[PDB]
């Protein structure tokens, strides 16, 4: 859905999520942590679950693995974002992916 675009911009700007930072704000290029199991701070994934209504505090049982898969899939299938594959660093101690936000009119 198109709701991811503005929400993710707001989360980067907020500075609440360590590692979710602008790399070049003027070109709308940002880093997002991309860790593997082996907590990893699921705060960003839980926030997306609450925002879309897939989770209710104290009613639904928490499911961090499913929350993580669901946000990663939304980003990968979105036409508003493009991974800069040659910039991502998946095999280091603090791994991350780099994405660019596609300007309106280019999509």
């Amino acid at each position: 859905n198109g709701k991811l675009r503005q929400w993710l911009i707001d989360q980067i700007d907020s500075g609440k999520y360590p590692g979710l930072v602008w790399e070049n704000a003027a070109a709308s290029i940002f880093r997002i942590p991309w860790k593997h199991a082996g907590e990893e701070d699921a705060a960003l994934f839980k926030a997306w679950a609450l925002f879309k209504g897939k989770f209710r505090e104290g009613i639904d049982k928490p499911d961090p693995p499913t929350w993580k898969t669901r946000l990663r899939s939304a980003l990968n299938k979105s036409n508003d974002f493009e991974e800069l594959v040659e910039r991502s660093q998946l095999d280091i101690s603090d791994p991350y992916k780099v994405y660019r936000i596609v300007p309106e009119g280019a999509l």
Side-chain angles (χ1 to χ4, degrees), residues 1-35 37-60 62-107:
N1 48 76
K3 291 287 181 294
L4 178 68
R5 185 191 174 102
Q6 189 62 60
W7 182 85
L8 193 48
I9 288 169
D10 287 350
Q11 304 325 299
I12 305 167
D13 283 335
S14 76
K16 270 183 295 186
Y17 308 95
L20 182 68
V21 290
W22 292 115
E23 178 161 306
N24 188 296
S28 292
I29 297 159
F30 69 94
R31 303 184 212 180
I32 178 168
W34 214 266
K35 307 173 187 303
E39 69 155 8
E40 71 136 292
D41 193 60
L44 185 71
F45 314 120
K46 182 175 184 183
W48 181 245
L50 285 154
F51 184 67
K52 302 287 294 178
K54 299 294 174 185
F55 178 75
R56 291 158 295 167
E57 184 68 37
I59 303 295
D60 303 314
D63 193 357
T66 297
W67 301 341
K68 184 169 156 183
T69 297
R70 210 150 46 192
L71 177 55
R72 287 188 177 186
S73 179
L75 181 56
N76 278 290
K77 288 187 176 293
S78 174
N79 297 119
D80 296 304
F81 299 90
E82 174 184 69
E83 182 184 355
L84 303 186
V85 176
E86 49 264 71
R87 287 202 200 196
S88 298
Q89 308 267 332
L90 300 182
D91 297 323
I92 55 168
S93 54
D94 287 312
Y96 62 86
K97 285 194 172 191
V98 179
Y99 287 83
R100 198 183 53 93
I101 302 180
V102 184
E104 297 165 63
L107 58 96

Coordinates of all heavy atoms in Angstrom, one line a residue, residues 31-93, unseen atoms left out:
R31 N 19.7 4.4 5.3 CA 20.1 3.1 5.7 C 19.0 2.5 6.6 O 18.4 3.3 7.4 CB 21.4 3.2 6.5 CG 22.6 3.8 5.7 CD 23.9 3.7 6.6 NE 24.8 4.8 6.3 CZ 26.0 4.9 6.9 NH1 26.4 4.0 7.8 NH2 26.7 6.0 6.7
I32 N 18.8 1.2 6.6 CA 17.9 0.5 7.4 C 18.6 -0.8 8.0 O 19.2 -1.5 7.1 CB 16.6 0.2 6.8 CG1 15.6 -0.6 7.7 CG2 16.8 -0.6 5.5 CD1 14.2 -0.7 7.2
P33 N 18.6 -1.0 9.3 CA 19.3 -2.2 9.8 C 18.7 -3.5 9.2 O 17.5 -3.6 9.0 CB 19.1 -2.1 11.3 CG 18.9 -0.7 11.5 CD 18.1 -0.2 10.4
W34 N 19.6 -4.5 8.9 CA 19.2 -5.7 8.2 C 19.9 -6.9 9.0 O 20.8 -7.5 8.4 CB 19.5 -5.7 6.8 CG 18.5 -6.4 5.9 CD1 18.6 -7.7 5.5 CD2 17.2 -5.9 5.4 NE1 17.5 -8.1 4.8 CE2 16.6 -7.0 4.7 CE3 16.6 -4.7 5.5 CZ2 15.4 -6.8 4.0 CZ3 15.4 -4.5 4.8 CH2 14.8 -5.6 4.1
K35 N 19.4 -7.2 10.2 CA 20.1 -8.2 11.0 C 19.4 -9.5 10.8 O 18.3 -9.6 10.3 CB 20.0 -7.8 12.5 CG 20.6 -6.4 12.7 CD 20.4 -5.9 14.2 CE 20.8 -4.5 14.3 NZ 22.2 -4.2 13.9
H36 N 20.1 -10.6 11.3 CA 19.6 -11.9 11.3 C 19.5 -12.4 12.7 O 20.3 -12.0 13.6 CB 20.4 -12.9 10.4
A37 N 18.6 -13.4 12.9 CA 18.5 -14.0 14.3 C 19.8 -14.7 14.7 O 20.1 -15.7 14.1 CB 17.3 -15.0 14.3
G38 N 20.5 -14.1 15.6 CA 21.7 -14.6 16.1 C 22.8 -13.6 16.2 O 23.5 -13.3 15.3
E39 N 17.4 -9.9 22.2 CA 16.5 -9.3 21.1 C 17.4 -8.5 20.2 O 18.4 -8.0 20.5 CB 15.4 -8.5 21.7 CG 15.8 -7.2 22.3 CD 14.7 -6.1 22.3 OE1 13.6 -6.5 22.0 OE2 15.0 -5.0 22.7
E40 N 16.8 -8.3 19.0 CA 17.5 -7.5 18.0 C 16.8 -6.1 17.9 O 17.0 -5.4 16.9 CB 17.4 -8.1 16.6 CG 16.0 -8.2 16.0 CD 16.0 -7.9 14.5 OE1 16.3 -6.7 14.2 OE2 15.8 -8.8 13.7
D41 N 16.0 -5.7 18.9 CA 15.2 -4.5 18.9 C 14.2 -4.6 17.7 O 14.5 -4.2 16.6 CB 16.1 -3.3 18.8 CG 15.3 -2.0 19.1 OD1 14.7 -1.9 20.2 OD2 15.2 -1.1 18.2
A42 N 13.0 -5.1 18.0 CA 11.9 -5.2 17.0 C 11.0 -4.0 17.1 O 9.9 -4.0 16.6 CB 11.1 -6.5 17.2
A43 N 11.5 -2.8 17.6 CA 10.6 -1.7 17.8 C 10.0 -1.2 16.5 O 8.9 -0.8 16.5 CB 11.4 -0.6 18.5
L44 N 10.8 -1.1 15.4 CA 10.3 -0.6 14.2 C 9.3 -1.6 13.6 O 8.3 -1.1 13.1 CB 11.5 -0.5 13.2 CG 11.1 0.1 11.8 CD1 10.7 1.6 12.0 CD2 12.1 -0.1 10.8
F45 N 9.5 -2.9 13.8 CA 8.5 -3.9 13.2 C 7.2 -3.9 14.0 O 6.2 -4.0 13.4 CB 9.2 -5.3 13.2 CG 10.6 -5.3 12.7 CD1 11.7 -5.7 13.5 CD2 10.9 -4.9 11.4 CE1 13.0 -5.7 13.0 CE2 12.1 -4.9 10.9 CZ 13.2 -5.3 11.7
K46 N 7.3 -3.7 15.3 CA 6.1 -3.6 16.1 C 5.3 -2.4 15.8 O 4.1 -2.4 15.8 CB 6.5 -3.6 17.6 CG 5.2 -3.6 18.6 CD 5.6 -3.8 20.0 CE 4.4 -3.8 20.9 NZ 4.7 -3.9 22.4
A47 N 6.0 -1.3 15.6 CA 5.3 0.0 15.3 C 4.5 -0.1 14.0 O 3.4 0.4 13.9 CB 6.4 1.1 15.2
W48 N 5.1 -0.8 13.0 CA 4.3 -1.0 11.7 C 3.1 -1.9 12.0 O 2.0 -1.7 11.4 CB 5.2 -1.6 10.7 CG 4.6 -1.8 9.3 CD1 4.4 -3.0 8.7 CD2 4.1 -0.9 8.4 NE1 3.8 -2.9 7.5 CE2 3.6 -1.6 7.3 CE3 4.0 0.5 8.4 CZ2 3.1 -0.9 6.2 CZ3 3.5 1.2 7.3 CH2 3.0 0.5 6.2
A49 N 3.3 -2.9 12.9 CA 2.1 -3.8 13.2 C 1.0 -3.0 13.8 O -0.2 -3.2 13.5 CB 2.6 -4.9 14.1
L50 N 1.3 -2.1 14.8 CA 0.3 -1.3 15.4 C -0.4 -0.3 14.4 O -1.6 -0.1 14.5 CB 0.8 -0.6 16.6 CG 1.1 -1.4 17.9 CD1 2.2 -0.7 18.7 CD2 -0.2 -1.5 18.7
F51 N 0.5 0.3 13.6 CA 0.0 1.3 12.7 C -1.1 0.8 11.7 O -2.1 1.4 11.4 CB 1.2 1.9 11.9 CG 0.9 3.1 11.0 CD1 0.4 4.3 11.5 CD2 1.0 3.0 9.6 CE1 0.1 5.3 10.7 CE2 0.7 4.0 8.8 CZ 0.3 5.2 9.3
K52 N -0.9 -0.4 11.2 CA -1.8 -1.1 10.2 C -2.9 -1.9 10.9 O -3.7 -2.4 10.2 CB -1.0 -2.0 9.3 CG 0.1 -1.2 8.5 CD -0.5 -0.3 7.4 CE -1.3 -1.2 6.3 NZ -1.9 -0.3 5.3
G53 N -2.9 -1.9 12.2 CA -4.0 -2.6 12.9 C -3.8 -4.1 13.0 O -4.8 -4.8 13.3
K54 N -2.6 -4.6 12.8 CA -2.4 -6.1 12.9 C -2.0 -6.5 14.3 O -1.8 -7.7 14.5 CB -1.2 -6.5 11.9 CG -1.5 -6.2 10.5 CD -2.6 -7.1 9.9 CE -3.0 -6.7 8.5 NZ -4.2 -7.5 8.0
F55 N -2.0 -5.6 15.3 CA -1.7 -5.9 16.6 C -2.4 -5.0 17.6 O -2.5 -3.7 17.3 CB -0.2 -5.9 16.8 CG 0.2 -6.2 18.3 CD1 0.2 -7.4 18.8 CD2 0.6 -5.1 19.1 CE1 0.6 -7.7 20.1 CE2 1.0 -5.4 20.4 CZ 1.0 -6.7 20.9
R56 N -2.9 -5.5 18.7 CA -3.6 -4.7 19.7 C -2.9 -5.1 21.1 O -2.9 -6.2 21.5 CB -5.0 -5.0 19.8 CG -5.8 -4.5 18.6 CD -7.1 -5.3 18.4 NE -6.9 -6.7 18.1 CZ -7.8 -7.7 18.1 NH1 -9.0 -7.4 18.5 NH2 -7.4 -8.9 17.8
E57 N -2.4 -4.0 21.7 CA -1.6 -4.2 23.0 C -2.5 -4.9 24.0 O -3.6 -4.4 24.4 CB -1.0 -2.9 23.5 CG -0.1 -3.0 24.7 CD 1.2 -3.8 24.4 OE1 1.7 -3.6 23.3 OE2 1.6 -4.5 25.2
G58 N -2.0 -6.0 24.6 CA -2.7 -6.7 25.7 C -3.8 -7.5 25.2 O -4.5 -8.2 26.1
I59 N -4.1 -7.6 23.9 CA -5.2 -8.5 23.4 C -4.6 -9.6 22.5 O -4.8 -10.8 22.8 CB -6.2 -7.6 22.6 CG1 -6.8 -6.5 23.4 CG2 -7.3 -8.5 22.0 CD1 -7.6 -7.0 24.6
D60 N -3.8 -9.2 21.5 CA -3.1 -10.2 20.7 C -1.8 -10.6 21.3 O -1.1 -9.8 22.0 CB -2.8 -9.6 19.3 CG -4.1 -9.1 18.6 OD1 -5.1 -9.9 18.6 OD2 -4.1 -8.0 18.1
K61 N -1.4 -11.8 21.1 CA -0.1 -12.3 21.5 C 1.0 -11.7 20.6 O 0.9 -11.7 19.4 CB 0.0 -13.8 21.5
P62 N 2.1 -11.2 21.2 CA 3.2 -10.7 20.3 C 3.8 -11.7 19.4 O 3.9 -12.9 19.8 CB 4.2 -10.1 21.4 CG 3.4 -10.1 22.7 CD 2.4 -11.1 22.6
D63 N 4.2 -11.3 18.2 CA 4.8 -12.2 17.2 C 5.8 -11.4 16.5 O 5.7 -11.1 15.3 CB 3.7 -12.7 16.3 CG 4.2 -13.9 15.4 OD1 5.4 -14.3 15.5 OD2 3.4 -14.5 14.7
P64 N 7.0 -11.2 17.1 CA 8.0 -10.4 16.4 C 8.6 -11.0 15.1 O 8.8 -10.2 14.2 CB 9.1 -10.3 17.5 CG 8.4 -10.5 18.8 CD 7.3 -11.4 18.5
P65 N 8.7 -12.3 15.0 CA 9.2 -12.8 13.7 C 8.2 -12.5 12.6 O 8.7 -12.2 11.5 CB 9.3 -14.4 14.0 CG 9.6 -14.5 15.4 CD 8.7 -13.4 16.1
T66 N 6.9 -12.6 12.8 CA 6.0 -12.3 11.7 C 6.0 -10.8 11.4 O 5.9 -10.4 10.3 CB 4.6 -12.8 12.1 OG1 4.6 -14.2 12.3 CG2 3.6 -12.4 11.1
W67 N 6.1 -10.0 12.5 CA 6.1 -8.5 12.2 C 7.3 -8.1 11.4 O 7.3 -7.3 10.5 CB 6.2 -7.8 13.6 CG 5.1 -8.0 14.5 CD1 3.8 -8.5 14.2 CD2 5.1 -7.8 15.9 NE1 3.1 -8.5 15.4 CE2 3.8 -8.1 16.4 CE3 6.1 -7.3 16.8 CZ2 3.5 -8.0 17.8 CZ3 5.7 -7.2 18.2 CH2 4.4 -7.5 18.6
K68 N 8.5 -8.8 11.6 CA 9.7 -8.5 10.8 C 9.5 -8.9 9.3 O 9.8 -8.2 8.4 CB 10.9 -9.3 11.4 CG 12.2 -9.0 10.8 CD 13.3 -9.5 11.7 CE 14.6 -9.8 10.9 NZ 15.6 -10.4 11.8
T69 N 9.0 -10.1 9.1 CA 8.8 -10.6 7.7 C 7.8 -9.6 7.0 O 8.0 -9.3 5.8 CB 8.2 -12.0 7.7 OG1 9.2 -12.9 8.3 CG2 7.9 -12.5 6.3
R70 N 6.8 -9.1 7.7 CA 5.7 -8.4 7.0 C 6.2 -7.0 6.6 O 5.8 -6.5 5.6 CB 4.5 -8.3 8.0 CG 3.2 -8.2 7.2 CD 2.1 -8.8 8.0 NE 2.1 -8.4 9.4 CZ 1.4 -9.0 10.4 NH1 0.6 -10.0 10.2 NH2 1.5 -8.5 11.6
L71 N 7.0 -6.3 7.5 CA 7.6 -5.0 7.1 C 8.6 -5.2 6.0 O 8.7 -4.4 5.0 CB 8.2 -4.3 8.3 CG 8.8 -2.9 7.9 CD1 7.9 -2.0 7.2 CD2 9.4 -2.2 9.2
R72 N 9.5 -6.2 6.1 CA 10.5 -6.4 5.0 C 9.8 -6.7 3.7 O 10.3 -6.2 2.6 CB 11.4 -7.5 5.4 CG 12.4 -7.1 6.5 CD 13.5 -8.2 6.7 NE 14.4 -7.7 7.7 CZ 15.5 -8.4 8.1 NH1 15.9 -9.5 7.5 NH2 16.3 -7.8 9.0
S73 N 8.7 -7.4 3.7 CA 8.0 -7.7 2.4 C 7.4 -6.5 1.8 O 7.4 -6.2 0.6 CB 7.0 -8.8 2.6 OG 6.2 -9.1 1.4
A74 N 6.8 -5.6 2.7 CA 6.1 -4.4 2.2 C 7.1 -3.5 1.5 O 6.9 -2.9 0.5 CB 5.4 -3.7 3.4
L75 N 8.3 -3.4 2.1 CA 9.4 -2.5 1.6 C 9.9 -3.1 0.2 O 10.1 -2.4 -0.7 CB 10.5 -2.4 2.6 CG 11.8 -1.6 2.2 CD1 11.4 -0.1 1.9 CD2 12.8 -1.6 3.3
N76 N 10.1 -4.4 0.2 CA 10.6 -5.0 -1.1 C 9.6 -5.0 -2.2 O 10.0 -5.0 -3.4 CB 11.0 -6.5 -0.8 CG 12.4 -6.6 -0.2 OD1 13.4 -6.4 -0.8 ND2 12.4 -7.0 1.1
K77 N 8.3 -5.0 -1.9 CA 7.3 -5.0 -3.0 C 6.8 -3.6 -3.3 O 5.9 -3.4 -4.2 CB 6.1 -5.8 -2.6 CG 6.4 -7.3 -2.6 CD 5.2 -8.2 -2.4 CE 5.5 -9.7 -2.5 NZ 5.8 -10.0 -3.9
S78 N 7.3 -2.5 -2.6 CA 6.8 -1.2 -2.8 C 7.4 -0.5 -4.1 O 8.6 -0.7 -4.3 CB 7.1 -0.3 -1.6 OG 6.7 1.1 -1.9
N79 N 6.6 0.2 -4.8 CA 7.1 1.0 -6.0 C 7.7 2.4 -5.5 O 8.2 3.1 -6.4 CB 6.0 1.2 -7.0 CG 5.5 -0.1 -7.6 OD1 4.4 -0.5 -7.5 ND2 6.4 -0.8 -8.3
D80 N 7.5 2.7 -4.3 CA 8.1 4.0 -3.8 C 9.5 3.9 -3.3 O 10.1 5.0 -3.0 CB 7.2 4.5 -2.6 CG 5.7 4.8 -3.1 OD1 5.6 5.7 -4.0 OD2 4.8 4.3 -2.5
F81 N 10.1 2.7 -3.2 CA 11.4 2.5 -2.7 C 12.3 1.6 -3.7 O 11.7 0.7 -4.3 CB 11.4 1.8 -1.3 CG 10.7 2.6 -0.3 CD1 9.4 2.5 -0.1 CD2 11.4 3.6 0.5 CE1 8.7 3.2 0.9 CE2 10.8 4.3 1.5 CZ 9.4 4.1 1.7
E82 N 13.6 1.9 -3.7 CA 14.5 1.2 -4.6 C 15.8 0.9 -3.8 O 16.4 1.8 -3.3 CB 14.8 2.0 -5.9 CG 15.9 1.4 -6.7 CD 16.2 2.3 -7.9 OE1 16.8 3.4 -7.7 OE2 15.9 2.0 -9.1
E83 N 16.1 -0.4 -3.7 CA 17.4 -0.7 -3.0 C 18.6 -0.4 -3.8 O 18.6 -0.6 -5.0 CB 17.4 -2.2 -2.6 CG 18.7 -2.6 -1.8 CD 18.9 -4.1 -1.5 OE1 18.0 -4.9 -1.8 OE2 20.0 -4.4 -1.0
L84 N 19.6 0.3 -3.2 CA 20.9 0.5 -3.9 C 21.8 -0.7 -3.5 O 22.5 -0.6 -2.5 CB 21.5 1.8 -3.4 CG 20.6 3.1 -3.7 CD1 21.4 4.3 -3.3 CD2 20.1 3.1 -5.1
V85 N 21.7 -1.8 -4.3 CA 22.3 -3.0 -3.9 C 23.8 -2.9 -3.7 O 24.3 -3.6 -2.7 CB 21.9 -4.1 -4.9 CG1 22.6 -5.4 -4.6 CG2 20.4 -4.3 -5.0
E86 N 24.4 -2.1 -4.5 CA 25.9 -2.1 -4.3 C 26.3 -1.3 -3.1 O 27.5 -1.3 -2.8 CB 26.5 -1.4 -5.6 CG 25.8 -0.1 -6.0 CD 24.8 -0.3 -7.1 OE1 23.7 -0.8 -6.8 OE2 25.1 0.1 -8.2
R87 N 25.4 -0.6 -2.4 CA 25.8 0.1 -1.1 C 25.5 -0.8 0.1 O 26.0 -0.5 1.2 CB 25.0 1.4 -1.0 CG 25.5 2.5 -2.0 CD 25.0 3.9 -1.5 NE 25.1 4.9 -2.5 CZ 25.0 6.3 -2.3 NH1 25.0 6.7 -1.0 NH2 25.1 7.1 -3.3
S88 N 24.6 -1.8 0.0 CA 24.2 -2.5 1.2 C 25.4 -3.3 1.8 O 26.3 -3.7 1.0 CB 23.0 -3.4 0.9 OG 21.9 -2.6 0.5
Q89 N 25.4 -3.6 3.1 CA 26.5 -4.3 3.8 C 25.8 -5.3 4.6 O 25.5 -5.1 5.8 CB 27.4 -3.4 4.6 CG 27.9 -2.2 3.8 CD 29.3 -2.4 3.2 OE1 30.0 -3.2 3.8 NE2 29.6 -1.8 2.1
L90 N 25.7 -6.6 4.1 CA 24.9 -7.6 4.8 C 25.7 -8.5 5.7 O 25.1 -9.3 6.5 CB 24.1 -8.4 3.8 CG 23.1 -7.6 2.9 CD1 22.4 -8.6 2.0 CD2 22.1 -6.9 3.8
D91 N 27.1 -8.5 5.6 CA 27.9 -9.5 6.3 C 28.8 -8.9 7.3 O 29.8 -9.5 7.6 CB 28.7 -10.3 5.2 CG 27.8 -11.1 4.3 OD1 26.8 -11.6 4.8 OD2 28.1 -11.2 3.1
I92 N 28.5 -7.7 7.8 CA 29.3 -7.1 8.8 C 28.6 -7.1 10.2 O 27.5 -7.6 10.3 CB 29.6 -5.6 8.5 CG1 28.3 -4.8 8.2 CG2 30.6 -5.6 7.3 CD1 28.5 -3.3 8.1
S93 N 29.3 -6.6 11.2 CA 28.8 -6.8 12.6 C 27.5 -6.0 12.8 O 26.7 -6.3 13.7 CB 29.9 -6.3 13.6 OG 30.4 -5.0 13.4

